């Protein structure tokens, strides 16, 4: 059904390729933590290309024409727009199925986030090559919401710690229960047939 | 004679017609669309308000270059105009339909206007006198008007 | 906007602001809201709203209006204003606002003399005017057919 994807440590084009392929099949995919999506190359080059993209505008009326979003979620949504056939009611329905968010929403705090191995910085890039941060680029050009998103991100990280301590306590309790006795009769079946 | 959209029964229905009457076809079409779907006393009070310029007729289809008015907001529309002569002729044919319902013997206080129809009659031509000695037509646009009324139950 | 908490005794000028036709209106605004003020069980559901207001908000704006009875005007409608309190912490800002509900704020209380304070308003209506009066462009000479 829903595919909640991490954005921490992913690449823009690779993640956009996998999302734009999997959204045409019907799986409702949502890319969360979009401010952490890395872009290869130099950061001066990335902001120079984005400055050229801002320079591209209609001269007779800039409103009727090129729109230039500054938020990184809308940057990734434009990246998936430029790959889906959005002028037809296949890519238009796919962009209606696609949802993108900066930070993490409260349902996606609770729901588990997936990590795509094919789009990772470590898998795809040589570790001695330069990179950038899409949230850093967005804060440098236009998107003035880094200080609020980072504060709410630290808040949900504190929430995640105070949940993970309870989860690890319950895991220690259930492994004490597994350490206890009189469960091995089924384990004679299970260890033979793939414990 | 025949009428388009014959009613459910001729017992509880009256009918009226005007033929070859000097009006504007577009104004009579728009005031007929403003009339249609209304009780007969409300339509009579509405046409009196049109002749007194207290409640307008919205122009929806034939709406080219027509100035706005504040009174069109009852109709959910922006443009409007107050056809005096069209309101007078259609009120006269509503009085004729009222008299025909009285002749047929209906409950005359509970009639609604189920069907109305307006179409272009044969027009009469005069001539203008434009520049360079040229003659251009100056043509009318009369209309045939039909209406089928129905009791409300 | 987290939630808006109004006062108890709301003036007739504010009611004329909330309504369009004061003659046709039956003057029925805030009857149930004043009932929520009057009821004892409604106070606990109202003081809890300030407890959440102390916790989650940072920008608190106080709504104020004008007394039209002290004016020689004819409008008799009180214009509402959100005024952002730029004071200290949210707790004492909320305590200040709840202490000074339904009270008057003079200009000598907040402002002062020789304080450089900007003015925001709406310009005059000059109507649908032309180009040389709007953009102050240069006029064409006398010999110009079709417009100067």
């Amino acid at each position: 059904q829903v595919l909640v994807l991490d954005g921490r440590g992913h690449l823009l084009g690779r993640l956009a390729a996998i999302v734009a392929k999997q959204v045409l099949l019907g799986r409702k995919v949502v890319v969360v933590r979009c401010e952490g999506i890395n872009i290869s190359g130099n950061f001066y080059r990335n902001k120079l290309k984005y400055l050229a993209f801002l320079r591209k505008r209609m001269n007779t009326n800039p409103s009727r024409g090129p729109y230039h979003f500054r938020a990184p979620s809308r940057i990734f949504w434009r990246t998936v727009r430029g790959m889906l056939p959005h002028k037809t009611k296949r890519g238009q329905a796919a962009l209606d199925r696609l949802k993108v968010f900066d930070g993490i929403p409260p349902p996606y705090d609770k729901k588990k986030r997936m990590v795509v191995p094919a789009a990772l910085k470590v898998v795809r890039l040589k570790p001695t090559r330069k990179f950038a941060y899409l949230g850093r680029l967005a804060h440098e050009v236009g998107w003035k919401y880094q200080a609020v998103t980072a504060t709410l991100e630290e808040k949900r990280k504190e929430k995640a710690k105070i949940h993970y301590r309870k989860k690890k306590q319950l895991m220690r309790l259930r492994k004490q229960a597994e350490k206890n006795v009189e469960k091995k009769i089924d384990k004679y079946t299970e260890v033979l047939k793939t414990h | 004679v025949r009428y388009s959209l014959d009613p459910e029964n001729p017992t509880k229905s009256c009918k009226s017609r005007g033929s070859n009457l000097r009006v504007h076809f577009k104004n009579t079409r728009e005031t007929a669309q403003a009339i249609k779907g209304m009780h007969i006393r409300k339509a009579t009070k509405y046409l009196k308000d049109v002749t007194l310029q207290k409640q307008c007729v919205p122009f929806r289809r034939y709406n080219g270059g027509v100035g706005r008015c504040a009174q069109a907001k009852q109709w959910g529309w922006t443009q409007g105009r107050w056809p005096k002569k069209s309101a007078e002729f259609l009120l006269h044919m509503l009085k004729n339909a009222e008299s025909n319902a009285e002749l047929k013997g209906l409950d005359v206080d509970s009639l609604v206007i189920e069907h109305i129809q307006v179409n272009k009659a044969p027009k009469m031509r005069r001539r203008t006198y434009r520049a360079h000695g040229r003659i251009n037509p100056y043509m009318s646009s009369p209309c045939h008007i039909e209406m089928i009324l129905t009791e409300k139950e | 906007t987290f939630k808006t908490v109004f006062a108890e005794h709301i003036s007739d000028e504010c009611k004329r602001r909330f309504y369009k036709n004061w003659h046709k209106s039956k003057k029925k605004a805030f009857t149930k809201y004043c009932k929520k003020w009057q009821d004892e069980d409604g106070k606990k559901q109202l003081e809890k709203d300030f407890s959440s207001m102390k916790k989650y908000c940072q920008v608190i704006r106080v709504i104020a209006h004008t007394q039209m009875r002290l004016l020689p005007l004819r409008q008799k409608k009180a214009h509402l204003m959100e005024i952002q309190v730029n004071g200290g912490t949210v707790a004492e800002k909320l305590d200040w606002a709840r202490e000074r509900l339904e009270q008057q704020v003079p200009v000598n209380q907040v402002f002062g003399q020789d304080e450089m304070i900007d003015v925001i308003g709406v310009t005059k209506g000059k109507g649908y005017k032309g180009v040389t009066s709007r953009w102050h462009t240069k006029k064409l000479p006398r010999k110009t057919h079709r417009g100067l």
């Binding site: - | - | 004016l71 952002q84 309190v85 730029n86 200290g88 925001i120 308003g121 953009w135 462009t137």
Partner: protein, 50 residues
């Protein structure tokens, strides 16, 4: 081309979306910033040009 007398441009592009404002009371687009060092005060009042 080569206009031969370069003139400064009439008007301003920053005031270009000219419209009868839907509000008639001039609203505040941006209030000044806050800090807990300053005491509690207000920022904006109403007035009438007498």
């Amino acid at each position: 081309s080569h206009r031969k007398f370069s003139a400064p441009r009439h008007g301003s592009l920053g005031f270009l979306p000219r419209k009868r404002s839907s509000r008639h009371r001039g609203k505040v687009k941006s209030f000044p910033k806050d800090d807990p060092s300053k005491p509690v005060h207000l920022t904006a009042f109403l007035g009438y040009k007498a």
